[PDB]
């Protein structure tokens, strides 16, 4: 995991986008 480690953050972060999307409409509506 020396290089291209961003893959983990990008792949995992992509999941957050799902919640942030809805939470943003309700939590930040």
UniProtKB/Swiss-Prot annotation:
Residue numbers carrying Asparagine amide: 28
Described function: VIP is a neuropeptide involved in a diverse array of physiological processes through activating the PACAP subfamily of class B1 G protein-coupled receptors: VIP receptor 1 (VPR1) and VIP receptor 2 (VPR2). Abundantly expressed throughout the CNS and peripheral nervous systems where they primarily exert neuroprotective and immune modulatory roles. Also causes vasodilation, lowers arterial blood pressure, stimulates myocardial contractility, increases glycogenolysis and relaxes the smooth muscle of trachea, stomach and gall bladder.
Protein name: Vasoactive intestinal peptide
Native source species: Homo sapiens
Positions spanned in the full protein: 125 to 153 of 170
């Amino acid at each position: 995991h020396s290089d291209a480690v961003f893959t983990d953050n990008y792949t995992r972060l992509r999941k957050q986008m799902a919640v942030k999307k809805y939470l943003n409409s309700i939590l930040n509506g």
